[PDB]
Structure 1
Amino acid sequence: MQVSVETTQGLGRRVTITIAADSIETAVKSELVNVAKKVRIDGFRKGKVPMNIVAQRYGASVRQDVLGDLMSRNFIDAIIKEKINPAGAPTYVPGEYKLGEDFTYSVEFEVYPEVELQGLEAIEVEKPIVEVTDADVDGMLDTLRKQQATWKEKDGAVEAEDRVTIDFTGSVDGEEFEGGKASDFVLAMGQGRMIPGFEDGIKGHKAGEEFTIDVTFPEEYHAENLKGKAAKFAINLKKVEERELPELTAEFIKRFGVEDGSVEGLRAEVRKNMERELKSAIRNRVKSQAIEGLVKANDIDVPAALIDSEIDVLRRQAAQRFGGNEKQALELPRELFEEQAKRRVVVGLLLGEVIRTNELKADEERVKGLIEEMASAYEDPKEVIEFYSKNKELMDNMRNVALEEQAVEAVLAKAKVTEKETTFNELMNQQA
Structure 2
Amino acid sequence: MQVSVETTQGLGRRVTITIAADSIETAVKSELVNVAKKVRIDGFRKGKVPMNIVAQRYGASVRQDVLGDLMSRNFIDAIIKEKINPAGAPTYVPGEYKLGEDFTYSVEFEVYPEVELQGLEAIEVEKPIVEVTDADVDGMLDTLRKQQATWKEKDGAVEAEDRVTIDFTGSVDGEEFEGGKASDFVLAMGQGRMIPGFEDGIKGHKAGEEFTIDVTFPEEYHAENLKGKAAKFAINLKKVEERELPELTAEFIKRFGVEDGSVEGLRAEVRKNMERELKSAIRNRVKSQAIEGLVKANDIDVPAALIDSEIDVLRRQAAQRFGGNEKQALELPRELFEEQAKRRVVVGLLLGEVIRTNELKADEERVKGLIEEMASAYEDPKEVIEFYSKNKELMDNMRNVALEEQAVEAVLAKAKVTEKETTFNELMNQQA
TM-score range, shorter chain: 0.5 to 0.7
Measured at CA, do residues 6 and 412 of structure 1 come closer, stay the same or move farther in structure 2, by a change above 3 Å? same
Measured at CA, do residues 182 and 300 of structure 1 come closer, stay the same or move farther in structure 2, by a change above 3 Å? closer
Mapped contact 1:164–1:237 kept (Cα < 8 A): no
How far apart in 2 are the matches of 1:215 and 1:43?
72
- TM-score for the superposition, normalised by structure 2: 0.57
How far apart in 2 are the matches of 1:75 and 1:126?
51
Output the aligned Cα RMSD: 11.0
Unaligned runs of 5+ in 1: none
Deviates more, 1:58-67 or 1:9-18: 58-67
How far apart in 2 are the matches of 1:196 and 1:394?
29
How far apart in 1 are the matches of 2:228 and 2:260?
56
CA drift at 1:299: 1.1
SS of the equivalent of 1:177 reads strand
How far apart in 2 are the matches of 1:93 and 1:171?
45
Mapped contact 2:169–2:181 kept (Cα < 8 A): yes
CA drift at 1:341: 0.8
CA drift at 1:400: 3.8
Measured at CA, do residues 75 and 356 of structure 1 come closer, stay the same or move farther in structure 2, by a change above 3 Å? farther
Measured at CA, do residues 76 and 14 of structure 1 come closer, stay the same or move farther in structure 2, by a change above 3 Å? farther
SS of the equivalent of 2:107 reads strand
Measured at CA, do residues 399 and 216 of structure 1 come closer, stay the same or move farther in structure 2, by a change above 3 Å? closer
CA drift at 1:188: 20
Mapped contact 1:315–1:330 kept (Cα < 8 A): yes
Identity over aligned pairs, percent: 100
- TM-score for the superposition, normalised by structure 1: 0.57
Mapped contact 1:145–1:245 kept (Cα < 8 A): no
SS of the equivalent of 2:170 reads strand
Unaligned runs of 5+ in 2: none
SS of the equivalent of 2:37 reads helix
Measured at CA, do residues 62 and 407 of structure 1 come closer, stay the same or move farther in structure 2, by a change above 3 Å? farther
SS of the equivalent of 2:153 reads coil
Deviates more, 1:323-332 or 1:27-36: 27-36
Deviates more, 1:189-198 or 1:272-281: 189-198
Mapped contact 2:95–2:105 kept (Cα < 8 A): yes
SS of the equivalent of 1:178 reads strand
How far apart in 1 are the matches of 2:263 and 2:278?
23
Partner of 1:376: 376
Mapped contact 2:124–2:416 kept (Cα < 8 A): yes
Mapped contact 2:166–2:237 kept (Cα < 8 A): yes
How far apart in 1 are the matches of 2:422 and 2:153?
39
SS of the equivalent of 1:204 reads coil
How far apart in 1 are the matches of 2:58 and 2:178?
87
Mapped contact 1:111–1:303 kept (Cα < 8 A): no
- Measured against aligned partners, the alpha-carbon deviations of 1:204-223 in whole angstroms (never above 9, x if no partner) come to 99999999999999999999
SS of the equivalent of 2:99 reads coil
Measured at CA, do residues 429 and 421 of structure 1 come closer, stay the same or move farther in structure 2, by a change above 3 Å? same
Measured at CA, do residues 65 and 387 of structure 1 come closer, stay the same or move farther in structure 2, by a change above 3 Å? farther
Mapped contact 1:8–1:14 kept (Cα < 8 A): yes
Deviates more, 1:188-197 or 1:391-400: 188-197
Deviates more, 1:289-298 or 1:377-386: 377-386
How far apart in 1 are the matches of 2:166 and 2:140?
31
Measured at CA, do residues 171 and 332 of structure 1 come closer, stay the same or move farther in structure 2, by a change above 3 Å? closer
SS of the equivalent of 1:160 reads coil
CA drift at 1:336: 1.2
Mapped contact 2:163–2:188 kept (Cα < 8 A): yes
Larger radius of gyration: 1
SS of the equivalent of 1:2 reads coil
Mapped contact 2:168–2:180 kept (Cα < 8 A): yes
CA drift at 1:347: 1.1
Mapped contact 1:319–1:329 kept (Cα < 8 A): yes
Mapped contact 1:11–1:113 kept (Cα < 8 A): no
Deviates more, 1:324-333 or 1:230-239: 230-239
Number of equivalenced pairs: 432
Measured at CA, do residues 84 and 353 of structure 1 come closer, stay the same or move farther in structure 2, by a change above 3 Å? farther
Alignment of 1:211-290 (within 5 A): 246-247=246-247, 250-253=250-253, 255-256=255-256, 263-290=263-290
Measured at CA, do residues 87 and 422 of structure 1 come closer, stay the same or move farther in structure 2, by a change above 3 Å? farther
How far apart in 2 are the matches of 1:219 and 1:42?
61
CA drift at 1:174: 28
Mapped contact 1:115–1:300 kept (Cα < 8 A): no
Which has the larger share of strand?
Answer: 1
Mapped contact 2:157–2:242 kept (Cα < 8 A): no
